[PDB]
Amino acid sequence: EEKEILWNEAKAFIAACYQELGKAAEVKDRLADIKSEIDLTGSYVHTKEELEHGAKMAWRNSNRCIGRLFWNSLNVIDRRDVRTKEEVRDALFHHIETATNNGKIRPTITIFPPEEKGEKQVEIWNHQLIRYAGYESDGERIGDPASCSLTAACEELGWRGERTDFDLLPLIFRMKGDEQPVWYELPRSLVIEVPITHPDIEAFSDLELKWYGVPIISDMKLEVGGIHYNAAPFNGWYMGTEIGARNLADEKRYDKLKKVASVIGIAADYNTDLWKDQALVELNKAVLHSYKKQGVSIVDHHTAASQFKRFEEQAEEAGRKLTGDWTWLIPPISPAATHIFHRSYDNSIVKPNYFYQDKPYE
Numbered sequence: 001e002e003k004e005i006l007w008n009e010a011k012a013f014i015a016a017c018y019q020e021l022g023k024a025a026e027v028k029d030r031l032a033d034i035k036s037e038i039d040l041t042g043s044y045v046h047t048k049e050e051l052e053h054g055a056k057m058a059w060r061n062s063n064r065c066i067g068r069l070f071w072n073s074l075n076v077i078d079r080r081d082v083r084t085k086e087e088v089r090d091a092l093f094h095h096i097e098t099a100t101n102n103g104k105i106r107p108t109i110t111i112f113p114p115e116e117k118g119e120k121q122v123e124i125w126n127h128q129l130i131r132y133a134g135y136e137s138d139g140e141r142i143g144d145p146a147s148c149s150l151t152a153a154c155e156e157l158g159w160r161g162e163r164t165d166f167d168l169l170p171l172i173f174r175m176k177g178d179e180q181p182v183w184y185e186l187p188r189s190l191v192i193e194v195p196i197t198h199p200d201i202e203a204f205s206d207l208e209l210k211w212y213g214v215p216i217i218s219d220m221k222l223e224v225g226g227i228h229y230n231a232a233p234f235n236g237w238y239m240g241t242e243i244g245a246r247n248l249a250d251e252k253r254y255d256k257l258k259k260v261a262s263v264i265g266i267a268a269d270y271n272t273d274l275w276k277d278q279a280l281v282e283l284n285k286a287v288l289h290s291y292k293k294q295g296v297s298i299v300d301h302h303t304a305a306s307q308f309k310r311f312e313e314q315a316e317e318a319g320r321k322l323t324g325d326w327t328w329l330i331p332p333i334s335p336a337a338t339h340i341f342h343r344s345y346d347n348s349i350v351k352p353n354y355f356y357q358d359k360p361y362e
């Protein structure tokens with residue numbers, strides 16, 4: 001039954017993939033090869049070509065992503081060879097470095113060995129490779145509350161955070177056969193960070209805000225023609241709203257709006273003043289300004305949406321269905337100023353694709 005699943009996802013994936021790659025005539029033979037391997041081993045191994053194209057396809061099918069125009073230039077690193085924890089760690093350091101690229105960020109995915117019998121070869125505990133710790137000490141909130149449970153799980157295993165608002169979590173992960181994950185402190189020289197300043201308002205620096213350059217999702221399974229790559233971290237660059245309007249603004253995250261309001265010299269007393277809205281805008285201006293001042297790639301939600309419009313035209317012109325999740329595609333500020341807001345999307349799940357999977361702690 002799982003063999004039938006795998007076989008079926010394999011047939012559908014290879015036909016689509018080779019058709020796209022112009023290699024249609026090779027399909028029958030490659031499929032025959034695959035059927036034996038699954039008969040003999042209970043699985044199969046992607047070629048380099050397939051793995052790269054599956055990764056890209058998976059990004060192109062990610063309904064919630066506004067950034068998909070650039071799906072086909074994804075930079076795919078194949079690390080199915082890794083067998084040791086040192087090799088996993090060094091792969092992850094390398095990805096950080098090669099994806100950061102001194103600020104000129106490269107959309108990059110590093111692919112580790114797939115699950116076998118639903119048994120994971122490498123289990124990565126981080127949600128993102130770079131992410132800040134979160135603490136809640138008897139009333140006292142420090143850092144990023146999203147990270148509270150992972151931070152506590154790291155601190156079980158003998159890591160200790162300095163308890164700044166921006167402690168970097170260690171890389172933490174578990175190898176098949178070990179009962180406990182290992183953790184490694186990130187080398188600071190690998191992590192770009194950006195101080196948040198405002199173009200006009202010098203006092204904004206009094207907030208002492210910063211964010212990291214590169215968002216590297218490290219907790220989603222990439223699935224390609226029946227094969228389950230649970231450990232396959234990927235990155236793009238940020239859209240400014242993600243930092244400016246959620247990570248720094250949500251009440252359940254850094255919750256900076258009142259402080260923003262103060263330093264930009266408006267009152268946070270009356271809803272009718274639209275102080276949250278004004279503050280959100282200046283904070284978001286800030287973010288894009290600071291990342292550009294520092295040479296770190298970033299996109300604003302207007303330019304992102306325009307690019308996504310182009311992705312829509314391209315799909316149709318290529319004769320492919322478009323899928324999307326309207327609720328995630330719309331930016332959380334000035335959504336109606338984008339074309340996305342004014343149309344609907346088909347939120348079907350097409351594979352290959354990225355998927356959530358259970359967190360090992362919690």
Ligand code: HEM
Nearest residue numbers: 059062064065066067107108234235236237238239299354
């Ligand atoms: C190149 C620059 C990129 C930008 C600006 C971009 C932008 C976005 C944004 C704004 C979201 C919504 C995030 C949120 O609200 O939490 C998102 C979600 C997503 N993106 Fe993209 N992205 C980019 C690259 C990529 C790449 C390279 C992949 C895969 C290879 C990808 C796969 C996804 C997935 C799977 C989600 C949804 C994750 C979830 O459900 O939590 N993104 N991205």
Ligand SMILES: Cc1cc(N)nc(COC[C@@H]2C[C@@H](OCc3cc(C)cc(N)n3)CN2)c1
Nearest residue numbers: 127215217219234235236237238239242356
């Ligand atoms: C690759 C990439 C580029 C870019 N500019 N931005 C991103 C944003 O990813 C962060 C978001 C926020 C996270 O929250 C949703 C979520 C929900 C649940 C239940 C589990 C989980 N792991 N993640 C997951 N993705 C990713």
Ligand SMILES: C[C@H](O)[C@H](O)[C@H]1CNc2nc(N)[nH]c(=O)c2N1
Nearest residue numbers: 064246326327328329330331332
């Ligand atoms: C479940 C509920 O719809 C939830 O608020 C969603 C909505 N839309 C979103 N859209 C984006 N881009 N990011 C998010 O984290 C959410 N959260």
Ligand SMILES: [Cl-]
Nearest residue numbers: 215242243247
């Ligand atoms: Cl984020």
